[PDB]
Design an enzyme around this catalytic site. Sequence first.
Site, PDB file in Angstrom:
ATOM      1  N   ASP A   1      33.382  41.326  12.000  1.00 38.76           N
ATOM      2  CA  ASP A   1      33.758  42.187  13.113  1.00 38.76           C
ATOM      3  C   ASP A   1      32.903  43.437  13.314  1.00 38.76           C
ATOM      4  O   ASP A   1      33.374  44.412  13.892  1.00 38.76           O
ATOM      5  CB  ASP A   1      35.219  42.610  12.947  1.00 38.76           C
ATOM      6  CG  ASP A   1      35.452  43.415  11.676  1.00 38.76           C
ATOM      7  OD1 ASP A   1      35.163  42.895  10.572  1.00 38.76           O
ATOM      8  OD2 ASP A   1      35.923  44.566  11.777  1.00 38.76           O
TER       9      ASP A   1
ATOM     10  N   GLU B   1      40.351  52.533   3.661  1.00 35.09           N
ATOM     11  CA  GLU B   1      39.226  52.538   2.738  1.00 35.09           C
ATOM     12  C   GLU B   1      38.829  53.880   2.147  1.00 35.09           C
ATOM     13  O   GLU B   1      38.542  54.836   2.864  1.00 35.09           O
ATOM     14  CB  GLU B   1      37.981  51.914   3.381  1.00 35.09           C
ATOM     15  CG  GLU B   1      36.727  52.169   2.542  1.00 35.09           C
ATOM     16  CD  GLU B   1      35.523  51.339   2.943  1.00 35.09           C
ATOM     17  OE1 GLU B   1      35.458  50.860   4.097  1.00 35.09           O
ATOM     18  OE2 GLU B   1      34.626  51.183   2.088  1.00 35.09           O
TER      19      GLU B   1
ATOM     20  N   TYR C   1      45.178  53.641 -18.512  1.00 34.05           N
ATOM     21  CA  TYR C   1      45.029  53.732 -17.063  1.00 34.05           C
ATOM     22  C   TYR C   1      46.261  54.372 -16.424  1.00 34.05           C
ATOM     23  O   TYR C   1      47.326  54.395 -17.079  1.00 34.05           O
ATOM     24  CB  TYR C   1      44.816  52.334 -16.475  1.00 34.05           C
ATOM     25  CG  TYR C   1      43.555  51.654 -16.970  1.00 34.05           C
ATOM     26  CD1 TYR C   1      42.406  51.606 -16.181  1.00 34.05           C
ATOM     27  CD2 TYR C   1      43.504  51.088 -18.245  1.00 34.05           C
ATOM     28  CE1 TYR C   1      41.230  51.012 -16.653  1.00 34.05           C
ATOM     29  CE2 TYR C   1      42.339  50.496 -18.725  1.00 34.05           C
ATOM     30  CZ  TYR C   1      41.208  50.461 -17.926  1.00 34.05           C
ATOM     31  OH  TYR C   1      40.056  49.880 -18.405  1.00 34.05           O
TER      32      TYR C   1
ATOM     33  N   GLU D   1      43.812  48.811   6.666  1.00 31.39           N
ATOM     34  CA  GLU D   1      42.637  49.133   5.862  1.00 31.39           C
ATOM     35  C   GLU D   1      42.392  50.622   5.639  1.00 31.39           C
ATOM     36  O   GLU D   1      41.756  51.287   6.459  1.00 31.39           O
ATOM     37  CB  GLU D   1      41.377  48.503   6.477  1.00 31.39           C
ATOM     38  CG  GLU D   1      40.070  48.970   5.832  1.00 31.39           C
ATOM     39  CD  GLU D   1      38.849  48.221   6.337  1.00 31.39           C
ATOM     40  OE1 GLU D   1      38.917  47.622   7.430  1.00 31.39           O
ATOM     41  OE2 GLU D   1      37.814  48.241   5.643  1.00 31.39           O
TER      42      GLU D   1
ATOM     43  N   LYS E   1      44.064  45.853   3.087  1.00 32.56           N
ATOM     44  CA  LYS E   1      42.633  45.709   2.827  1.00 32.56           C
ATOM     45  C   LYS E   1      42.184  47.028   2.210  1.00 32.56           C
ATOM     46  O   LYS E   1      41.714  47.931   2.902  1.00 32.56           O
ATOM     47  CB  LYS E   1      41.856  45.446   4.127  1.00 32.56           C
ATOM     48  CG  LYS E   1      40.361  45.272   3.912  1.00 32.56           C
ATOM     49  CD  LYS E   1      39.638  44.894   5.202  1.00 32.56           C
ATOM     50  CE  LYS E   1      38.150  44.695   4.954  1.00 32.56           C
ATOM     51  NZ  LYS E   1      37.371  44.709   6.195  1.00 32.56           N
TER      52      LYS E   1
ATOM     53  N   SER F   1      38.241  40.094   1.892  1.00 35.15           N
ATOM     54  CA  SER F   1      38.022  40.315   3.319  1.00 35.15           C
ATOM     55  C   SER F   1      36.639  40.947   3.250  1.00 35.15           C
ATOM     56  O   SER F   1      36.474  42.166   3.357  1.00 35.15           O
ATOM     57  CB  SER F   1      39.013  41.300   3.933  1.00 35.15           C
ATOM     58  OG  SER F   1      38.702  41.464   5.310  1.00 35.15           O
TER      59      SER F   1
ATOM     60  N   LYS G   1      42.689  44.071  12.698  1.00 37.97           N
ATOM     61  CA  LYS G   1      42.167  44.918  11.637  1.00 37.97           C
ATOM     62  C   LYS G   1      41.887  46.309  12.198  1.00 37.97           C
ATOM     63  O   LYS G   1      41.451  46.457  13.344  1.00 37.97           O
ATOM     64  CB  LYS G   1      40.877  44.328  11.063  1.00 37.97           C
ATOM     65  CG  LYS G   1      40.536  44.850   9.674  1.00 37.97           C
ATOM     66  CD  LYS G   1      39.035  45.062   9.502  1.00 37.97           C
ATOM     67  CE  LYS G   1      38.549  46.228  10.349  1.00 37.97           C
ATOM     68  NZ  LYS G   1      37.105  46.521  10.105  1.00 37.97           N
TER      69      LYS G   1
END
Lengths: 363, 363, 363, 363
Positions: A33, A189, A363, A187, A229, A300, A146
């Site tokens: 995309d 990010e 962690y 998403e 995502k 993805s 998306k």
Amino acid sequence: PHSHPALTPEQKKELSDIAHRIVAPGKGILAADESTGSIAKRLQSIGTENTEENRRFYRQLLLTADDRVNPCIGGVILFHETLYQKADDGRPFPQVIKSKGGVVGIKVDKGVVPLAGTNGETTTQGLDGLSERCAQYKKDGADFAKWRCVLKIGEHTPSALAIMENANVLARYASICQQNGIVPIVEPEILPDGDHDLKRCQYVTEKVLAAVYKALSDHHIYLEGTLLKPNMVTPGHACTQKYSHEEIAMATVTALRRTVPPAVTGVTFLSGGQSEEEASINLNAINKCPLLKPWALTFSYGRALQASALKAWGGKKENLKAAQEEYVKRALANSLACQGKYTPSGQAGAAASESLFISNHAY
Amino acid sequence: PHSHPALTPEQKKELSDIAHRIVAPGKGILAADESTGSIAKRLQSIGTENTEENRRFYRQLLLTADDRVNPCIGGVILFHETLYQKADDGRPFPQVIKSKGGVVGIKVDKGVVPLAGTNGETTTQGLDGLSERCAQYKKDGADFAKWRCVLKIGEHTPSALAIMENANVLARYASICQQNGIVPIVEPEILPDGDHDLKRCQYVTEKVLAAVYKALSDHHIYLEGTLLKPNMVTPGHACTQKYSHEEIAMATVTALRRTVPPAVTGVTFLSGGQSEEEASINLNAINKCPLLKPWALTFSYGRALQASALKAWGGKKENLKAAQEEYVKRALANSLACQGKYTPSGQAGAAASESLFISNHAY
Amino acid sequence: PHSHPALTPEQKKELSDIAHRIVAPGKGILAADESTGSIAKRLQSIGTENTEENRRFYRQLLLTADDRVNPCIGGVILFHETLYQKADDGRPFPQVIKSKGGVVGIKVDKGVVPLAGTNGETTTQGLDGLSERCAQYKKDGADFAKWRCVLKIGEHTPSALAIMENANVLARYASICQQNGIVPIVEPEILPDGDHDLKRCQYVTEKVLAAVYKALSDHHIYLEGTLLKPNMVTPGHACTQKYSHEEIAMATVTALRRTVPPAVTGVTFLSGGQSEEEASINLNAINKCPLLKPWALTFSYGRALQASALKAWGGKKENLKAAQEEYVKRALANSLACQGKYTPSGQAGAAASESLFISNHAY
Amino acid sequence: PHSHPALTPEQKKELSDIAHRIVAPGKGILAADESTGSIAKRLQSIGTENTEENRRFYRQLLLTADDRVNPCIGGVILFHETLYQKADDGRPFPQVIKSKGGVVGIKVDKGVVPLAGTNGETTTQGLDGLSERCAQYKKDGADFAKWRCVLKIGEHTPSALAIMENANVLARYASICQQNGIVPIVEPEILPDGDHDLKRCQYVTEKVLAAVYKALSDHHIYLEGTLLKPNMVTPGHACTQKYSHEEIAMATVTALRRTVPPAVTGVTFLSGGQSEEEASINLNAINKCPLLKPWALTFSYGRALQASALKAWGGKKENLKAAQEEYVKRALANSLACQGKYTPSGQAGAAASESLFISNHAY
């Protein structure tokens, strides 16, 4: 305190069914995309003129690879232009994708914009007229969408405003999508940019995702009808300290386990600049992580699925087969990776230390 | 955007290990932490004078039940007074509990208080000097704690303020506990009072839990080192519509899957007024619910484990054995229920499967 | 969206009347509520032993100063112990304060506690049983209360959590006070510690106060029945860049104008380490600032009203008159300052120009 | 905790200067920014075809009213179409407005959109490409903008989601405007629809405005460079209880005093369905309200300035003069009203001694 059902049982079933199809076992998403400005960089990278025909040919090249990619590709994300283009046989690209067993996706955001009063932070635009756009995209073959928000780790970032605002716009976008039978891929990010370490990325990722899901909850989002995502948890691109794939996997799975409700149907990782092999090896390590993972953990990928294909193509029509072959190789690699069955060369094999135990409490 | 570790890897390990021991397969929690006021009502119910000796004798009755309860009880919640009492043999109750394989818990809240400007809503107090109290309790044998917040479903409740405030105070309580090696059980109880239906309870439970976990995130709570004690999702006590145990189970599990991160070690349901058998049947249905459940789903019952025992005792030392037998029967029933193996057919394993006609999209 | 009156018109009137009396034209607050630990550090700076009698004597010295302070003091904040102590004539200190036209106030917080997961940040405790304490304090002569939260400017502070939590607990404290006829003085002090400049302090103060009033709104606090005790906006104590009093006044008034609703009855500035003279000069500049100020801008000084008094006293009874004289001097100065009619006098002693800045116990 | 100045001193001065010019003493705003769909309803109410020519003529009629309106109109809000139209003499409408001493404003929102999962609630769209639009509008003569959000008082409304989302989008719009030298008018209109009473409207208005300003703070909005366009506080249209203009004024001013920071340059009330006289009389009572108001309290009327003018015009060019006369009379009336000197029939004296017997504690 009062419920006003955003969706009917029928609408929920449709969204859940779509989301599950996209991330069915062994399947991932091909993110093709790239907007006009992004794909331009890509073609420029191989000395290729950025014309509509070249963009159509390159996309056709990926979408029409042989049937070996069918069981590897659950979904394909397209940019507006491409959703309306046709292959050489006259078939609309959405028809080509569907005939190969893939769900058609459409990127709907309109890019990032600067947040005033922040240290270069952004939010994302694209909500205006989104409902109508979604209704049309649905009619034209798309079943999921998306939207990309971008956050960065720096001295004072991501700031509270950036986290709050990006989470909020993602929720608005998700809400509108679901009202139109479109599964929204959320998403958020967090860029790998910087010299921060793994722990820092894990901390920021945990805080960002907690914000994202609280926003989705406030906006009455049906999680089963969504996909996430996110960035994998990794050290910064310029981090001096080095880590192993197992550490990256543990940090990633731990962050997700602490923030993503089991109801989310799947997690489709963005490759974010990782090489094709790095992205596949990390996804494999993530799926082999010895922790309970209640959602599909797949891919993805944009760059991590196209890097070699684009290069093998070089803009020459006679390199079609060669370019498609490279894409197939990566689709196969990642299909195995999202199942934890991927092996590049040989891994560690020998050399088993004495003090290096597998403690997730670190962690 | 910067991490300042609230806990070291060693502290995390200790909290995680404690939490896991409490909800290990087949184990639940005996909630015998009734404050002086609550226990008064219980003794009142059986015409027994509320003296410290009768309370000690009663608690002793439950704690010294025969070894059959050992694999059923992973933890026992006590009220301050009881933590410092001894059995007839001179053994401190915490030692008695530990000798039978259970972890010792201590209730630390100081009751509810009214929230001004709300329709009869409350928050809970007890943070003052809490860290010192936890350090002392830890030293005296307690490894986990409990704090109860109460919310009500009504015309304008739970309000945004009530949800926000109760979630925030629970986070503070959890934070202080973890700093002292104490696993906090977060109890955001939504009362069953009212004529609302199953959907309404599920909606409110979902909103409440989403707020609870966002708060725990904001306060940097280590989820792996915590437990959740929520109400099951059920129709209101005065609801005219009837529901099956399978529907209650589906609504409950759905609500939890949409809000509780998989990192949470376990969910220990409160019985909230349900009869002993009703609480066992529902817990069983919850564990048989076909949906994926990434956390232990067990019990933290007070009334549902003591109802018959208290009645059989009636304040007469002569009925000790009969009273203990009632408690043991419920402990055994719930041990099977938290494994989805409860049947009225004594103690079986994996009940008869039936069908999958209905769908979860109606939830 | 539905109102459930936290207060009746009668209750509002009482609170509003009390708040206005405290900050009536030309009047300020004597903050003599230093807890046992803080007052001890004060008696130590003068080699005086920290005994109950010495504390009683010192407090008597301040409270029984001549009638010249009457028009200067609208209220006096006391610590629990002092509220129940009596002057040499047998009169309870509250009666002494009232007879001089002052409103009696009581500090009710129980000190700061560390917020886990932060860089040395804190929140404040003291809500447990606060309602009953307020009811009793009211019966014993107190009409207003004070609660101190402490924030620090650093590279990562104040954090989102610290701001949110401190704002929330102040709101809880304010709510409980108003339910008991007590005017709550909200004190969100941002320490002057550090080398940050004026604009940094202004920025932080604006963000903190915005958070404080949103929380007060969420908790349904009657602003007209409250007072704000904030830090003035000044550069850090270690800041290299120098500023005039006019700049400090402008930054302070601008910050307040951008965050404090007109309904707030008054702002009573803490001196926060400034010298007696500096605190008076700055307060005067604040009242002379051209911008529109819809609330009384006065003082609630502890150190800036007692510096010279403590020194003159030196723990010797024979220095009673001398010590009281120093206090009266500062009360008169600040009374003129809160009216914008103060112009430093000829002699004020090196004790009035001495920095009263002192770091905290933790760092 | 760290500041990254959204605006420079020069940018702030420009915004502050513009804001002050619009609400200068005796001045208000003519809201003639009805979008195509809204103006359509106005024209059909007088049987006039909704053509661009009729819209242009009608707007010309208002904008070219005689010089008597000059001192009454500080600003004029236009819809996109009108900003680019010209009067019959060839002069661009923006030029017409400025020649009469008015600041040109541009409405920039793109209407309301439904919020899924709510009881008929909405948010407002229009952020996409807003920065570029503002830069273009600025270049073309506009110095301020307007954005309308709509909230409704009902059983479950306005909801937490609706309040939070509308406040957030208003802040985003505000931020973008200020980055382009445009003063944003924030319009969070709470409809008068319903049978709720005055205190209910006051409560909701207070909560909404508190949310709006917290959002503006989170988004770093420079309040001095903004204006607020809120609904006055009134009972619902269907409320059976009657109130005096003084009560409406008291509730309105009290609500604003409890939520709007003094830094806000001005409040320009929407007429929201009130008749021309009612709107003027209420604005007058508001300015005569005895409480302290640190901001200009004027008008931003659409219907209340055009009602009689629209009717007098009737879509007939021959009625030009008659129509303009009606608008001029309302402009004069409201100019006096925002000064508290308006008396519906024959003027007498602008005498302002005190107020009536109305205890503010009842609000």
